């Protein structure tokens, strides 16, 4: 580890700096270093880890989509042959994306999930596990596609089970997990009815609990509820 010689606290400080500078690759490397110190992560630290990698893989996903669309057009009738370059470059980006996903999944497996006992942390990490298997599924075309999809499903399902037992229906983590698992159903698992049912039930159960919340907690929960509504509007 290139970050092995840097203090944990210094890695966290520099991750925050990197965020301010929009240097997300650096942020991710700093937070990977911090995880590899072996201590559990605080709430704030968990969010720095997730922000960093979300931004890195998000850019990779956007690039992969551009290249995939070009490649698809090249394989239409009437399209002039341009050689192997589009496929090669799409494959390069894809391999880099898969590497980032594997890195995140490796951190979760060694050893973030196994040491996470509180519902808030365990659900957070299992949501991440679902998310990064979902990103792998987006690009999967082979013998392992079914198994990748099932790995995403399994992680999301364990997170859902804990969240329903241990967290209120307005909890932001719970809401964001449901949002993403609903997208998994719609976009990955070919289950739009399940996606819609999940989004609606989640929204409605949150609405019924808003009365318990402070002004600040209300703002947090309603923001995510709006994303559920936005998806429902897209899908219906």
């Amino acid at each position: 580890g290139a970050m092995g010689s840097m203090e944990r606290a210094s890695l966290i400080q520099k991750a925050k700096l990197a965020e301010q500078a929009e240097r997300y690759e650096d942020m991710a490397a700093f937070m990977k270093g911090a995880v590899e110190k072996g201590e559990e992560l605080s709430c704030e630290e968990r969010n720095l880890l997730s922000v960093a990698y979300k931004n890195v893989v998000g850019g990779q996903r956007a690039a992969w989509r551009v290249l995939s669309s070009i490649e698809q057009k090249s394989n239409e009738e009437g399209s002039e042959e341009k050689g192997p370059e589009v496929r090669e470059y799409r494959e390069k980006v894809e391999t880099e994306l898969q590497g980032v996903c594997d890195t995140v999944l490796g951190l979760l497996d060694s050893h973030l999930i196994k040491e996470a006992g509180d519902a808030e942390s365990r659900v957070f990490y299992l949501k991440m596990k679902g998310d990064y298997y979902r990103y792998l599924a987006e690009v999967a075309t082979g013998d392992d596609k079914k198994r990748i999809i099932d790995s995403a499903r399994s992680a999301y399902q364990e997170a859902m089970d804990i969240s329903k037992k241990e967290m209120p229906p307005t909890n932001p983590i719970r809401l964001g997990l449901a949002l993403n698992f609903s997208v998994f159903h719609y976009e990955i698992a070919n289950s739009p009815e399940e996606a819609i049912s999940l989004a609606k039930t989640t929204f409605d159960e949150a609405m019924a609990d808003l009365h318990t919340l402070s002004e600040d907690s209300y703002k947090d929960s309603t923001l995510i509820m709006q994303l559920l509504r936005d998806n429902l509007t897209l899908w219906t």
Binding site: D131, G176, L179, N180, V183, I224, D230, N231, L234, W235
Partner: peptide, 5 residues
């Protein structure tokens, strides 16, 4: 694309 967080 749909919203995720």
């Amino acid at each position: 694309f749909p919203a995720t967080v």
